C-alpha positions as a printed Julia matrix, in Angstrom:
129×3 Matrix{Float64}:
  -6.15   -7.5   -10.85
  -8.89   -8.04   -7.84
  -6.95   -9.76   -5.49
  -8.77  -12.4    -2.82
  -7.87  -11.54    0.4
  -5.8   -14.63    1.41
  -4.15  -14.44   -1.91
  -2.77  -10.99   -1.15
  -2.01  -12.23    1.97
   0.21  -14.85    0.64
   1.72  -12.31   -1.82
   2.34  -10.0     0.36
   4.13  -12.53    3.07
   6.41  -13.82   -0.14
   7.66  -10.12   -0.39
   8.48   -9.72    2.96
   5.5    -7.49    4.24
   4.8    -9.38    7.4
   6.12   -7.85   10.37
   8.15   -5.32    8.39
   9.46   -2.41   10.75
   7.17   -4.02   13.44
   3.99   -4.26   11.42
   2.05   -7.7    11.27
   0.71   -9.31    7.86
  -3.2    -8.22    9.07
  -2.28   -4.52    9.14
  -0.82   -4.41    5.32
  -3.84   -6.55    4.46
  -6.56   -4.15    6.02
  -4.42   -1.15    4.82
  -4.95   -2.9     1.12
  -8.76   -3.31    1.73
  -9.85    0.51    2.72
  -7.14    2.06    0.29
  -7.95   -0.28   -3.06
 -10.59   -3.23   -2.01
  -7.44   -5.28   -3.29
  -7.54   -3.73   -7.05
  -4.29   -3.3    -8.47
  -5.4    -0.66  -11.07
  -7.47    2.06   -8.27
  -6.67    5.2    -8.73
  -7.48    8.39   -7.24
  -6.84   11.61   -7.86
  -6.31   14.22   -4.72
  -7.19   17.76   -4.73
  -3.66   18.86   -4.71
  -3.11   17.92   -8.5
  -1.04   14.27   -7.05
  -2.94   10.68   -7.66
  -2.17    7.69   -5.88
  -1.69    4.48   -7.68
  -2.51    0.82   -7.17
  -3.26   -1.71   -3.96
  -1.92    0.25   -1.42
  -2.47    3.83   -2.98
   1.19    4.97   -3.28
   1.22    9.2    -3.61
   3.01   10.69   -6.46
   3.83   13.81   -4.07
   6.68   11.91   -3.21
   6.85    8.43   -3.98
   6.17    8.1    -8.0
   6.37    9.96  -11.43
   3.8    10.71  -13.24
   4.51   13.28  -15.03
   1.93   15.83  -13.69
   2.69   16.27  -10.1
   4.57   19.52  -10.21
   6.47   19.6    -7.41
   6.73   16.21   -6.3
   9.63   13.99   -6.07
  10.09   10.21   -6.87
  11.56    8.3    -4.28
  10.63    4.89   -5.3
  12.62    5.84   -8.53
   9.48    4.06  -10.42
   6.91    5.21  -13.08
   3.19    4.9   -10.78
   2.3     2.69  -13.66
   4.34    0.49  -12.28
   2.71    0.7    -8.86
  -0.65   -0.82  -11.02
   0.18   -3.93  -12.32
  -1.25   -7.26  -11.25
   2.52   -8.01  -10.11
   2.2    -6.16   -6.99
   6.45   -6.39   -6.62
   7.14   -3.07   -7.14
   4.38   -1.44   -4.78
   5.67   -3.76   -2.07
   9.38   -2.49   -2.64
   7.38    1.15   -2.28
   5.85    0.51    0.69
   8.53   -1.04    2.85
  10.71    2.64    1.61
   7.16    5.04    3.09
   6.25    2.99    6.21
  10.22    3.45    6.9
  10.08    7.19    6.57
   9.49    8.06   10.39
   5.27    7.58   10.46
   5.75    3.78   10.06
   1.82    3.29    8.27
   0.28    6.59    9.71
   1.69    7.82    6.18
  -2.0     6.1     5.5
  -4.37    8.23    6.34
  -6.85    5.1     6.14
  -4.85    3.17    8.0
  -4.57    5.26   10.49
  -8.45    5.73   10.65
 -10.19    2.4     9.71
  -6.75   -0.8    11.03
  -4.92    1.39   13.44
  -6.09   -0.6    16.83
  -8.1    -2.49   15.3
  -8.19   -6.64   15.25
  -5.84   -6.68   12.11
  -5.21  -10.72   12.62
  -8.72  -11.31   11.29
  -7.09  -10.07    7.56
  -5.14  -13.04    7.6
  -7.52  -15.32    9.37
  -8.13  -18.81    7.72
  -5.61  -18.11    5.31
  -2.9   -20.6     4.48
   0.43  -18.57    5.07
Protein backbone atom coordinates (compact mmCIF):
# COMPACT_ATOMS: atom_id res chain seq x y z
CA UNK A 1 0.00 0.00 0.00
CA UNK A 2 0.95 3.82 -1.17
CA UNK A 3 -0.08 5.63 1.64
CA UNK A 4 -1.33 9.59 1.22
CA UNK A 5 0.48 11.57 3.39
CA UNK A 6 -2.31 12.74 5.78
CA UNK A 7 -3.54 9.24 5.84
CA UNK A 8 -0.27 8.00 7.31
CA UNK A 9 -0.42 10.75 9.38
CA UNK A 10 -3.62 9.73 10.88
CA UNK A 11 -2.35 6.11 11.12
CA UNK A 12 0.46 6.80 12.54
CA UNK A 13 -1.16 9.28 15.40
CA UNK A 14 -3.81 6.17 16.11
CA UNK A 15 -0.65 4.05 17.03
CA UNK A 16 0.79 6.35 19.20
CA UNK A 17 3.73 7.78 17.00
CA UNK A 18 3.19 11.41 17.78
CA UNK A 19 5.47 12.76 20.20
CA UNK A 20 6.83 9.32 21.11
CA UNK A 21 10.17 9.65 23.23
CA UNK A 22 9.95 13.42 22.36
CA UNK A 23 9.46 13.13 18.63
CA UNK A 24 6.49 15.11 16.92
CA UNK A 25 3.99 13.43 14.28
CA UNK A 26 5.96 15.62 11.24
CA UNK A 27 9.28 13.89 12.00
CA UNK A 28 7.83 10.09 11.67
CA UNK A 29 5.97 11.41 8.64
CA UNK A 30 9.12 12.91 6.79
CA UNK A 31 11.17 9.91 8.12
CA UNK A 32 8.32 7.71 6.10
CA UNK A 33 8.69 9.92 2.93
CA UNK A 34 12.72 9.74 2.26
CA UNK A 35 12.92 6.03 3.62
CA UNK A 36 9.68 4.47 1.51
CA UNK A 37 7.70 7.53 -0.33
CA UNK A 38 4.91 5.96 2.02
CA UNK A 39 5.03 2.29 0.27
CA UNK A 40 4.46 -0.38 2.58
CA UNK A 41 6.15 -3.08 0.38
CA UNK A 42 9.94 -0.95 -0.36
CA UNK A 43 12.57 -2.85 0.07
CA UNK A 44 16.16 -2.49 -0.10
CA UNK A 45 18.83 -4.48 0.12
CA UNK A 46 22.28 -3.08 1.87
CA UNK A 47 25.67 -4.07 0.97
CA UNK A 48 26.21 -5.91 4.13
CA UNK A 49 23.93 -8.93 3.03
CA UNK A 50 20.77 -7.18 5.63
CA UNK A 51 17.50 -5.55 3.75
CA UNK A 52 15.26 -3.25 5.29
CA UNK A 53 11.58 -3.73 5.05
CA UNK A 54 8.49 -1.58 4.63
CA UNK A 55 7.40 2.35 5.40
CA UNK A 56 9.91 3.17 7.65
CA UNK A 57 12.75 0.75 6.38
CA UNK A 58 13.19 -1.43 9.52
CA UNK A 59 16.98 -3.32 9.29
CA UNK A 60 17.10 -6.99 9.63
CA UNK A 61 20.72 -6.52 11.32
CA UNK A 62 18.87 -6.24 14.30
CA UNK A 63 15.35 -5.63 14.23
CA UNK A 64 13.72 -8.57 11.90
CA UNK A 65 14.20 -12.21 10.55
CA UNK A 66 14.61 -12.94 7.44
CA UNK A 67 16.26 -15.69 7.23
CA UNK A 68 19.45 -14.49 5.40
CA UNK A 69 21.02 -11.99 7.63
CA UNK A 70 23.72 -14.08 9.18
CA UNK A 71 24.53 -12.56 12.09
CA UNK A 72 21.75 -10.46 12.90
CA UNK A 73 19.37 -10.61 15.68
CA UNK A 74 15.52 -10.02 15.86
CA UNK A 75 14.47 -7.75 18.36
CA UNK A 76 11.08 -6.93 17.18
CA UNK A 77 10.55 -10.78 17.55
CA UNK A 78 8.67 -10.40 13.96
CA UNK A 79 9.15 -12.00 10.46
CA UNK A 80 10.20 -8.45 8.10
CA UNK A 81 7.26 -9.65 6.13
CA UNK A 82 5.43 -8.49 8.62
CA UNK A 83 7.06 -5.07 8.62
CA UNK A 84 5.36 -4.92 4.69
CA UNK A 85 1.90 -5.16 4.98
CA UNK A 86 -0.60 -2.43 4.24
CA UNK A 87 -1.42 -2.73 8.15
CA UNK A 88 1.44 -0.71 9.15
CA UNK A 89 0.76 -2.05 13.15
CA UNK A 90 3.56 -4.02 13.46
CA UNK A 91 6.28 -1.55 11.93
CA UNK A 92 4.92 1.05 14.33
CA UNK A 93 5.37 -1.41 17.40
CA UNK A 94 9.15 -1.67 15.65
CA UNK A 95 9.82 1.66 15.56
CA UNK A 96 8.77 2.95 18.95
CA UNK A 97 11.44 -0.36 20.28
CA UNK A 98 14.67 1.40 17.65
CA UNK A 99 14.01 5.14 18.22
CA UNK A 100 14.12 3.92 22.09
CA UNK A 101 17.49 2.28 21.71
CA UNK A 102 19.73 5.37 22.80
CA UNK A 103 19.90 7.33 19.03
CA UNK A 104 16.17 8.25 19.40
CA UNK A 105 15.63 8.55 15.11
CA UNK A 106 19.41 9.12 14.24
CA UNK A 107 19.10 5.14 13.96
CA UNK A 108 17.78 6.74 10.39
CA UNK A 109 20.39 7.59 8.55
CA UNK A 110 17.76 9.62 6.31
CA UNK A 111 16.35 11.08 8.97
CA UNK A 112 19.13 12.24 10.24
CA UNK A 113 20.17 13.79 6.79
CA UNK A 114 17.00 14.98 4.91
CA UNK A 115 14.02 15.87 8.67
CA UNK A 116 16.64 16.31 11.30
CA UNK A 117 16.16 20.35 11.76
CA UNK A 118 14.15 20.62 9.33
CA UNK A 119 10.31 22.18 9.34
CA UNK A 120 8.83 18.63 10.12
CA UNK A 121 5.19 20.34 11.02
CA UNK A 122 4.67 20.88 7.30
CA UNK A 123 4.26 16.65 7.14
CA UNK A 124 1.26 17.01 8.99
CA UNK A 125 0.10 20.32 7.67
CA UNK A 126 -3.61 20.52 6.51
CA UNK A 127 -4.17 17.23 7.73
CA UNK A 128 -7.15 16.37 9.89
CA UNK A 129 -5.53 14.73 13.09
Amino acid sequence: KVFGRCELAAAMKRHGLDNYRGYSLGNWVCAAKFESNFNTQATNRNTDGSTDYGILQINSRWWCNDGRTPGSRNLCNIPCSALLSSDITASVNCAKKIVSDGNGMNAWVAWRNRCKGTDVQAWIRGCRL
